[PDB]
């Protein structure tokens, strides 16, 4: 079937990183198809900003929690409070991400412990934190990826690291939810390079590459979500998701669970 | 090329988790080749047997060095430890992890902090700290990792996390240090199920599958190594490689440099 913006509409959702990037665009999609929804960041003075357009844009709610995801238990505290503001949760949406810039890997070893805390670590804490009412609902979780987690680019081994320990667990996380019968989806969303102002002030001067939209990114991401598909690649060319798509991986991980003590499910 | 045993005559290597399983197993091999090598593992008592059975072995030099993995400070401090020791170093061997059981995802957050700072983050820090010997020497660093690190299972979420983390980001300083002409080389070890101890105790009752024998295992890793190559699949099928080798994504790779400004390496 196809997505249909009455889909969100009524529908609680959280969205981190909310404050500016791509995060801000989708929390205005999700406001537009009349949702509810509590966004987060650090800067209080800008979730207020994105807050408010977002009653004008036609948001049936719209508060924000501010506090940083370096702290585990501000995100384990987060979910939380969030849910009984809204009653229950419909969509989890991990978008942020601790800074990063362009650089030769040299020896940033304390810089590199905090890209795994915030762009991972905290990732798999709200994820269980949400799970119990993402299962009441037979929700569904948004976790924000990037080419750079299904392949290798030069200057930003740190964060690729986290993008790939994501794939990793989610994607773990969610077949170990489909063999027990747990109707709560995980989308890996795959993107290309974005209009943001983050990504393009940060690549200036080092990689000239064509970006794409930071507002039609954010539908596409909703979109695929909402229609509960695993994987969503968002890029300039149509050969990414099959160059990236890795059908070889889908095999093996099919005949693996072959060899599992279906009881143990 | 060919490999050849006496390749590894005269050089000096640190290998971690030598204390059992694949880890001893390159130990012995190293010692038959008559290399020079220093081990590491937390067992001290354990440690000792196997230094012993090295020199035995006709190693050209063995010693020992105990502690835990989860003390960032002692793996910076062993490199360099190991590396007065045998002066110098020639080839690192990234193998040890944290223990790990074949469960569920519930709640484990500090279990899987743990997983990412002895699986991943011990092993970028023992490679910052190794690579200005690898430098003089033109050596190479190998990590190990498992189908799990390219691929994904039910029951192994964080350390499937960690595995992935690993290709994240030495896939990224390979190449990065191919980029910049320093002639050292990373071997990623993609191993299939393996018949260690710990392996055939943990699947007990949840899984099938057939093992693959521990010192074909080890000597396979040592000669991938050796022969420096970028990644190295080990498993009773031949189909592994071509499946989860994942072309695609070395295209992807490849013309993902033309993008960037070649006076940044
Ligand atoms: N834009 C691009 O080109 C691409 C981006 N991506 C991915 O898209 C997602 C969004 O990226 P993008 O919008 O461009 O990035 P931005 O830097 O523009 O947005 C990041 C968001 O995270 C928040 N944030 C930053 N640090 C922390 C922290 N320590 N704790 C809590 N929140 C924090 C920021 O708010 P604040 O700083 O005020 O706290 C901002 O709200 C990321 O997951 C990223 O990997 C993937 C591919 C491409
Ligand atoms: N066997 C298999 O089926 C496969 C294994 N692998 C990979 O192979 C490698 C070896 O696995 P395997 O030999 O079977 O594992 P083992 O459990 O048999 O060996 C683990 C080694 O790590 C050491 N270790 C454990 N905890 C710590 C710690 N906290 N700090 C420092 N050292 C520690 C152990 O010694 P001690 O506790 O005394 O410190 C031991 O010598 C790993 O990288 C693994 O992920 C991959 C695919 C298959
Ligand atoms: C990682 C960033 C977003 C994204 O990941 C970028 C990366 C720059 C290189 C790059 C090229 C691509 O075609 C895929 C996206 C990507 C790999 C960006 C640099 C900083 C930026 C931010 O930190 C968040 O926007
Ligand atoms: C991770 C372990 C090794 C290896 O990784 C195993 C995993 C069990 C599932 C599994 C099946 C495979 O066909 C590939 C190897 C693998 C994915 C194993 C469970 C415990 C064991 C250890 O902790 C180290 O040996």
Redesign the pocket.
Known sequence: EEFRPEMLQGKKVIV????????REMAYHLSKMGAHVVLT???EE?LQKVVSRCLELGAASAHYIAG???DMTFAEQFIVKAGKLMGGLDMLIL?????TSLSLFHDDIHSVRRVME?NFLSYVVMSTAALPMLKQSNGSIAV?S?LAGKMTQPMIAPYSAS?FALDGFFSTIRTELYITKVNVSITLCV????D????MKEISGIINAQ?SPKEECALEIIKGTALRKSEVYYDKSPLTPILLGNPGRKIMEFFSLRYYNKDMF
Chains 1, 2 share one sequence.
Do not use: F
């Open positions: 981190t990183g909310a404050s500016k990037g791509i995060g960041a650090r800067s800008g940083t995801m370096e978008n942020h991400i601790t800074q915030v924000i990037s993008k993107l290309g390079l974005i943001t102002e983050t990504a970006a």
